[PDB]
Amino acid sequence: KVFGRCELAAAMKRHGLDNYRGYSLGNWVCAAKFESNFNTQATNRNTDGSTDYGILQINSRWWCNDGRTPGSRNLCNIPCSALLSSDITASVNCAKKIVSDGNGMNAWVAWRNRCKGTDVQAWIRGCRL
Numbered sequence: 001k002v003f004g005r006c007e008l009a010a011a012m013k014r015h016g017l018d019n020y021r022g023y024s025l026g027n028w029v030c031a032a033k034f035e036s037n038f039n040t041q042a043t044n045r046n047t048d049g050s051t052d053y054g055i056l057q058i059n060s061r062w063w064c065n066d067g068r069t070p071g072s073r074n075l076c077n078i079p080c081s082a083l084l085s086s087d088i089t090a091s092v093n094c095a096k097k098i099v100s101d102g103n104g105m106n107a108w109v110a111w112r113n114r115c116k117g118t119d120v121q122a123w124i125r126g127c128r129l
């Protein structure tokens with residue numbers, strides 16, 4: 001599923017991401033835009049052989065099991081395919097674990113390089129929340 005901007009903002013707010021660990025909603029929408037272009041089915045392979053999955057591009061090196069990343073962890077206790085669903089619940093619940101691990105949203109390279117320090121509230125402007 002490719003979400004609209006405000007559709008995704010509303011879904012993330014319903015799932016408790018607004019101000020989660022101090023990150024306002026616009027941060028999460030900005031991160032999803034640049035990680036996946038709002039596409040739940042996005043996948044991208046990393047140099048080390050791991051793969052990033054879904055709207056927030058969560059990495060099989062640490063967070064999910066895809067059966068093909070030897071020596072990796074599965075800290076969210078889910079198959080990586082669950083992160084491609086049109087229902088964002090699994091991605092949001094796993095993202096909550098990632099952001100709480102000590103590095104905040106710096107875990108998402110696109111957030112650090114394209115959202116951090118910008119006017120992220122612009123990403124939720126006009127949306128009915």
Ligand SMILES: [Cl-]
Nearest residue numbers: 024025026121
């Ligand atoms: Cl915001």
Ligand SMILES: [Cl-]
Nearest residue numbers: 067068069070
């Ligand atoms: Cl594996």
Ligand SMILES: [Cl-]
Nearest residue numbers: 021103104105
């Ligand atoms: Cl933080």
Ligand code: NA
Nearest residue numbers: 060064072073
């Ligand atoms: Na894994």
